[PDB]
């Protein structure tokens, strides 16, 4: 297994920007992706901001307590995924 | 790792409210998600919607055989994920 | 765990059409996925096009050198993950 890992979160659309300019602020982060999802939940339903984030597993306190900022007011789910390889193909 | 794993599922547009009709109704369930994805297989390719489910493992079964009846004439990708870790910032 | 596997890789828009005819050439590859994201770097963003090709361990080697070669002048980003378990439901 891998070093590196996927947080995945699930974040309302208002606290998008917030979520950008924090992670744009992180030296350990070589970039991140987002994406536009459509989330159920308890049932209500609605659209949010997918966010993809590569990182170091053992930067990953310091990205989550980052983000857990943005989030004071805005709850959002996340997970966590293992990560085999990564890299750049050329 | 982790008790919780994620469910992917590839699901064609026609059976998309009946699936979600079968995951609102599963209390194991804290809530899923929903996108829209292109898809190609054996070549033709099409439209198809998305589905993320994080469940507990243990429940893995119960959810599957639930999926697979609402798929009983429209089948249905899937794989399994593993999760490190999962939850909710704020 | 097991033998399959998920290859993520963000391409960018322009060699779309050369991954996919790249793909639907390998026989080992029962079909893939595609879909638009926003993807930030270093920081500039844009967006892309994220393929998700479900593939054996087995041909991971097979599989990236011959991606490897569409990516010859477009850099892509890329990372494989895990998957417990994968199939068809019905």
Chains 1, 2, 3 share one sequence.
């Not at 659309?13 to 924090?22: G, L, P, R, S």
């Not at 930067?59 to 709850?75: R, S």
Request: hydrophobic share 45%; charged share 20%.
């Amino acid at each position: 297994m891998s070093t590196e890992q996927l947080l995945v979160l699930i974040a309302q659309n208002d606290i998008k920007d917030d979520i950008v300019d924090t992670l744009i602020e992180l030296e350990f982060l070589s970039g991140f992706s987002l994406g536009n999802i459509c989330g159920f939940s308890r049932e209500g339903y609605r659209e949010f901001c997918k966010f993809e984030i590569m990182h170091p597993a053992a930067q990953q306190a310091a990205l989550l307590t980052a983000l857990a900022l943005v989030c004071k007011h805005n709850p959002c789910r996340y997970w966590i995924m293992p990560i085999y390889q990564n890299g750049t193909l050329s």
